[PDB]
């Protein structure tokens, strides 16, 4: 039936400052069906202490989820978000950019 690809955005809650605490967010929206796998990556390794919002959907019935975890951005640490879905042939990795 209807299968829509998730739109992925990787961002921090506050403007990134090295040494200061923040929250790493991976916003996944516009996907269908609701079955979705989202992992946050730190230097290529999956972050374990990752929380996600409750499953909801928008006016167009497409679902949206917010996966987040607390982190402290540094100059050398690279963060990314990996998302797998039925509409994706391979898991999509979106690297975090402080300026997006």
């Amino acid at each position: 039936m209807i299968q829509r690809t998730p739109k992925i955005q990787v961002y921090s809650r506050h403007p990134a400052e090295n040494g200061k605490s923040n929250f790493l967010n991976c916003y996944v929206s516009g996907f269908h069906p609701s079955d979705i796998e989202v992992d946050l990556l730190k230097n290529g390794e999956r972050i374990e202490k990752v929380e996600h919002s409750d499953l909801s959907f928008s006016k167009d019935w497409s679902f949206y989820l917010l996966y987040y975890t607390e982190f402290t951005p540094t100059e050398k640490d690279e963060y990314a978000c990996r998302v797998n879905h039925v509409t994706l042939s391979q898991p999509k990795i979106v690297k975090w950019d402080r300026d997006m």
């Binding site: 039936m1 209807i2 299968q3 829509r4 739109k7 955005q9 961002y11 809650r13 506050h14 403007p15 929250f23 967010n25 916003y27 929206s29 269908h32 069906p33 609701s34 079955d35 919002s53 409750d54 499953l55 909801s56 959907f57 019935w61 497409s62 679902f63 917010l66 987040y68 300026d99 997006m100």
Partner: protein, 275 residues
């Protein structure tokens, strides 16, 4: 000025995996305040906002039995819709339900809603008159006829014009500091060179509520819609939202581009330049 309460229900069949998955969430404007997860251990309506957890046990017990009733109701709909479409037992299907009410600046009833979706497609929806249904396919025509004979719209209209807006007004009062606030967006602009002759000018909007906001790029008063990269409003995780719009500017024309931000928190619309 206007406000709205929304309840979202998602029921997903799990063939060969046991009982269907039921997830229910509640929203007042862009703020979630309740949740229910059929896979959760509590099996109760749980608070998701600081202003709603103070509600006594009478509120949470009433919401719990009702959301569990909706879980059972949707579980029957999964089988009912399967028979309507002549589908098998190995297929995973999704049922979605949304209803709620909107109020104006005077907190008076404005609009009601009650609609369904099957596998991401519109199924049946209550029209604006709150007396008729819009059924897309033939299977939804059966549901409309049963709802017409049972007078489902009459009871729904009593709820949408009554209990819905009465408690939509109630949550707004208990959470005045959270729902009745208007946070102006903190705006700033970013500049990055892609080459020696092009640069990306990114206009930021941060820490605003509600999520409704408009970021447009203009060049000498001309809208750059086709060349503007505009992301969807995203949650920050703290009750606020974010959004940015970027345009590719040739080096030397940065004084030609302006950013425009419109939001309820701003007393006047903002015009941003790089200068």
């Amino acid at each position: 000025g206007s406000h709205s309460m929304r309840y979202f229900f998602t029921s997903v069949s799990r063939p060969g995996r046991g009982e269907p998955r039921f997830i229910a969430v509640g929203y007042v404007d862009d703020t979630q305040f309740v949740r229910f997860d059929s896979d959760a251990a509590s099996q109760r309506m749980e608070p998701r906002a600081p202003w709603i957890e103070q509600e006594g046990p009478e509120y949470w017990d009433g919401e719990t039995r009702k959301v569990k009733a909706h879980s059972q109701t949707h579980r029957v709909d999964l089988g009912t819709l399967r028979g309507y479409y002549n589908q098998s037992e190995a297929g995973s299907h999704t049922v979605q339900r949304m209803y709620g009410c909107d109020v104006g600046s005077d907190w008076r009833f404005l609009r009601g809603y009650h609609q369904y979706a099957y596998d991401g497609k519109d199924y049946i929806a209550l029209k604006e008159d709150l007396r008729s249904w819009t059924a897309a396919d033939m299977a939804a025509q059966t549901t409309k006829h049963k709802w017409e004979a049972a007078h489902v719209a009459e009871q729904l209209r009593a709820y949408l014009e009554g209990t819905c807006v009465e408690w939509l007004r109630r949550y707004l009062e208990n959470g005045k500091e959270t729902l009745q606030r208007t946070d102006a967006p903190k705006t700033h602009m970013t500049h990055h060179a892609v080459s020696d002759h092009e640069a990306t000018l990114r206009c930021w909007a941060l820490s605003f509520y509600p999520a409704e906001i408009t970021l447009t790029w203009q060049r000498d008063g001309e809208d750059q819609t086709q060349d503007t990269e505009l992301v969807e409003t995203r949650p920050a995780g703290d009750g606020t939202f974010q959004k940015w719009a970027a345009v590719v500017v040739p080096s030397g024309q940065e004084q030609r581009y302006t950013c425009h931000v419109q939001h309820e928190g701003l007393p006047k619309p903002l015009t941003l330049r790089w200068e």
